[PDB]
Design a binder for this molecule. Structure first.
Ligand SMILES: [Zn+2]
Lengths: 135, 85, 97, 235, 129, 217, 33
């Protein structure tokens, strides 16, 4: 389990952080977000409520983890240790790569635009010929 | 335009006698600007008080701000508490 | 089977573009968010009786228009993903030889 | 030149009597190519209502009032025809049909999928067809990038949490995360293509040392054996 | 403190040459395939490492694959190779024969092959057929 | 530096006198800001590229151009040699490291060569009227629905395969004509289930506000 | 380009001498043809 130091103060976030999407490496507590202590450049639209708790049994991939994975891939372009800790550190490199490859992203558009027995019977006949000497 | 300014400050004198109601560090946190009080978080996007249709000087004293905030009715909440157990 | 989820609730309507939700848009037929929440609220409880719903909304909406609205609510993704002579020619030659 | 958007621009600029589109043959008829019978439910009809209600003051400088009133007559006539046909249509119903359930399911799901432009399964190379795929993805990107950033949910399960005037419910962002997973997954497409190339061109590039039924064939073993022949030493 | 003074040269397991020499000496067939492939690569690319002058207990380790190939050559006048177990022995025998062919252009790995009075019986057998 | 505090959680029903841990404190009232939310930016502003990936509308979208699986490699076979015009006793070919023989390779070579209430009540779903549903309501109601949805699916394929984005005026007109019929049965027949499946959420706008700490240059 | 560790009766200098003696000969064979 990591720790999330709240930006603009020194506090520790309890179980819910508010991730910023334009500095991309800051967080906030709930109380610093309710009152608007996050500087006049940001606008309270670009803060997603993320959690901090350990999720359920693995290979579930909640939308928070998918979002943080794609944030990491936009950040680093490589360096899957620096992706897997940014997911939360409770996932391995060898599973983040197995999940970024197994995503149907353009499969729906492919399905939009684009909508023998003889020798097996011969093999069964030969397997029947290799049973009794009389043939 | 910088980002990494401090924007919170702490005075050295421990005045922690009548302060259990404010936001403590765990001292007292003293920011560089005030707070922002927001009445209701969810806008009610229709409601011709706000939508202003183009058809047809009048005042209206509506009860509270709770008209503009999508509150659920109580019969659903009792139905869901009945579905609880 | 794994499928990318068909997120209908985000998707803006193509044919009419006037039956969307009020956030995706940029008697009276206006359908503010309060009557919309009351409509989903009445459909969760009353289960298609169309007259307790028709005044649970608040009386400005006809039953015809409530059906007109109910025909354009998005469906769950996990329900879209829920509803959706060569034999004898060898034997006759294997019996002989 | 989009006169049915010029009326909207004159309405939203709050100055429509000051110009009034200069209704002559040179201006009011150059944008029409009568008026073209507006398409929307009321978004192009309330504009005509306000346009006639503003043009009641001059009443003679604008000759195009008569075609607009003819279209009002057309709308009233079509409405009366539809009301008579709806009166007859509710009288033309058979007393018993007993409409089947498991086809009503399919018609509802099929109509809902055909509303919002997604592919419906039936149950009833070539760079011509490469651009016709790569022009549907730009559609979805430039449709998701016009959603408002202050988008939020209101589920039917916040009633069990008793949210006060300022309490910050914990299911407010179940649509804005989903509207960014799509928008950033449709921009990281030519990164997973470049990872899949490095995967396939290093799994298939061996193909005769890992797969058992290929490295046990006669010809593959003979070729791998014959490439390793060291050249003959003369004397 | 005791886990800091490890010798760096042996902390990968056994070295590869003893790995190849033990893999053939066992009976696991896929590990025999691996060992013969690596012996073939080292025989092509650097034969002096597998010079028979240096490693004397290596030529019977190839005789035990090459000498049962005579039965296969005897039975090869009919369609003898039926299952996928005799064919694997055939391919191992041909690959070991190639390894001894590649080591025989050295003039110091050659006299050991000549003084053996049993490889010449195999050469005479193949030439008679 | 001129600092500020947090909001005191003193209730509106407290009525106590204002105590102060310091007399060098001052107290102020915060007026809540309230109005139509200032138009928030779009999602293209929130989460644009800060990377070096390309757009997925660039011409390299191939993924298989120079693949060449090793089932498709050229295998070494026999090399037939030619000496001259009158050399018919020479060793004719050469097989150093070949896979197959001369006989099988020769065989492989061989086998290849004006009212008022009738004017505000107005949709585009009633401009057409009905004109057919009266006639077809006398029999079954459901055949026209499937025969129209198949036409919608064919027209949607024909719009995908034509690089057109706006729907035509021929299927829009044919869309509402479907949605009318499925309405009327629900008006008339009261079919025994009419199933309910909703996502149990719907998107609403929420208020935005700038931060209160000023900018630092 | 894969290296290896192994045991040998020669030093590391003598192995490099043998590598020179082998690669000169293979260099002459491949540059001659
Ligand atoms: Zn904080």
């Amino acid at each position: 389990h990591k720790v999330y130091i709240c930006h603009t103060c020194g506090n520790e976030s309890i179980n819910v952080r508010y991730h910023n999407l334009r500095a991309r490496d800051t967080n906030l507590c709930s109380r610093c977000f309710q009152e608007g202590h996050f500087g006049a450049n940001f606008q309270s639209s670009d803060f997603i409520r993320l959690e901090n708790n350990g999720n359920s049994v693995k290979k579930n991939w909640s939308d928070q983890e998918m979002l943080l994975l794609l944030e990491g891939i936009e950040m680093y372009e490589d360096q899957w240790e620096k992706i897997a800790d940014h997911v939360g550190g409770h996932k391995r490199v060898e599973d983040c790569i197995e999940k970024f490859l197994s995503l149907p992203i353009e499969d729906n558009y492919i399905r939009e635009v684009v909508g023998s027995k003889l020798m097996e019977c011969v093999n069964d006949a030969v397997q029947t010929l290799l049973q009794g000497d009389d043939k | 335009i910088m980002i990494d300014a401090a924007s919170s400050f702490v005075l050295p004198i421990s005045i922690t006698k009548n302060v259990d109601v404010l936001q403590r560090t765990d001292e007292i946190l003293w920011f560089r600007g005030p707070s922002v009080i927001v009445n209701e978080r969810i806008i009610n996007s229709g409601d011709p008080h706000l939508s202003l249709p183009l058809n047809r000087n009048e005042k209206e004293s509506l009860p509270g701000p709770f008209v503009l905030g999508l509150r659920p009715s109580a019969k659903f909440t009792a139905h869901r508490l009945s579905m609880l157990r | 089977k794994k499928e990318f989820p068909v997120n209908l609730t985000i998707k803006k309507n193509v044919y009419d573009s006037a039956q969307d939700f009020n956030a995706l848009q940029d008697v009276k037929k206006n359908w503010s968010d309060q009557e919309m929440l009351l409509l989903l609220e009445g459909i969760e409880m009353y289960e298609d009786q169309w007259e307790k719903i028709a005044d649970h909304v608040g009386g400005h909406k006809r039953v015809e228009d409530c059906i007109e609205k109910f025909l354009s609510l998005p469906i769950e993704d996990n329900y879209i993903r829920e509803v959706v002579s060569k034999l004898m020619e060898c034997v006759n030659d294997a019996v002989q030889t | 030149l989009q006169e049915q958007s010029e009326l909207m621009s004159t309405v939203m600029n709050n100055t429509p009597t000051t110009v009034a589109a200069l209704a002559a043959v040179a201006a009011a008829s150059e944008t029409n190519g009568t008026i073209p019978k507006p398409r929307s439910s009321a978004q192009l009809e309330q504009l005509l209502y306000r346009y006639r209600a503003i043009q009641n003051h001059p009443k003679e400088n604008k000759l195009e009032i008569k075609a607009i009133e003819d279209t009002f007559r057309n709308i009233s006539r079509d409405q009366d025809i539809y009301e008579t046909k709806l009166d007859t249509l509710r009288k033309s119903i058979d007393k018993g049909f007993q409409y089947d359930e498991d086809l009503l399911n399919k018609h509802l799901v099929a109509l809902q999928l055909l509303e919002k432009d997604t592919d419906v399964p039936d149950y009833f190379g070539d760079p011509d067809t490469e651009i016709r795929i790569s022009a549907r993805i730009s559609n979805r990107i430039n449709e998701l990038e016009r959603l408002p950033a202050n988008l939020g949910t209101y589920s039917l399960d916040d009633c069990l949490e008793f949210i006060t005037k300022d309490d910050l419910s914990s299911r407010m962002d179940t649509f804005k995360i989903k509207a960014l997973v799509e928008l950033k997954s449709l921009k990281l497409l030519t990164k997973q293509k470049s990872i899949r190339q490095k995967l396939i061109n290093n799994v298939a590039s061996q193909a005769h040392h890992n797969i058992p039924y290929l490295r046990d064939s006669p010809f593959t073993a003979a070729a791998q054996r014959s490439v390793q022949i060291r050249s003959k030493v003369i004397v | 403190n005791v886990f800091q003074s490890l010798p760096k040269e042996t902390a990968r397991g056994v070295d590869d040459l003893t790995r190849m020499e033990m893999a053939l000496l066992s009976g696991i067939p896929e590990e025999i395939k691996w060992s013969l492939k690596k012996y073939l690569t080292y025989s092509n690319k650097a034969p002096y490492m597998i010079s028979l002058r240096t490693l004397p207990d290596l030529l019977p380790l190839f005789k035990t694959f090459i000498l049962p190939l005579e039965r296969i050559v005897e039975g090869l006048n009919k369609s003898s190779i039926c299952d996928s177990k005799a064919m694997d022995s055939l391919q191992m025998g041909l690959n070991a024969l190639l390894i001894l062919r590649n080591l025989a252009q050295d003039t110091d790995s050659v006299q050991i092959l000549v003084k053996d009075r049993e490889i010449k019986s195999f050469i005479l057998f193949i030439l008679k057929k | 530096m001129d600092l500020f505090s947090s909001i005191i959680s003193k209730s509106n029903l407290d009525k106590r006198p204002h105590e102060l841990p310091n007399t060098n404190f001052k107290i102020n009232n915060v007026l809540p800001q309230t109005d139509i939310e200032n138009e928030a930016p779009r999602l293209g502003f929130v989460g644009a590229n800060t990377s070096n990936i390309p757009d997925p509308t660039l011409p390299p979208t191939e993924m298989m151009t120079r693949f060449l699986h090793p089932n498709w490699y050229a295998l070494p076979t026999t090399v037939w040699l030619k000496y001259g015009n009158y050399n018919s006793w020479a060793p004719s070919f050469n097989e150093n490291g070949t896979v197959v023989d001369s006989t099988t390779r020769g065989l492989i070579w061989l086998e290849r060569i004006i009212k008022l209430q009738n004017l505000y009540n107005w949709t585009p779903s009633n401009y057409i009227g009905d004109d057919e549903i009266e006639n077809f309501r006398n029999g079954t109601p459901d055949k026209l629905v499937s025969d129209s949805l198949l036409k919608l699916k064919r027209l949607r394929k024909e719009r995908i395969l034509n690089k057109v984005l706006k729907p035509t005026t021929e299927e829009r007109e044919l869309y509402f004509k479907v949605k009318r019929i499925l309405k009327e049965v629900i008006l008339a027949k009261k079919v025994s289930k009419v199933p309910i499946n909703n996502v149990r959420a719907f998107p609403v706008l929420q208020t935005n506000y700038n931060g209160s700490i000023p900018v630092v240059r | 380009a894969v290296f290896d560790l192994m045991t040998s009766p020669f030093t590391q200098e003598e192995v490099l001498i043998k590598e020179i003696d082998f690669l000169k000969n293979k260099l002459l064979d491949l540059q001659s043809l």
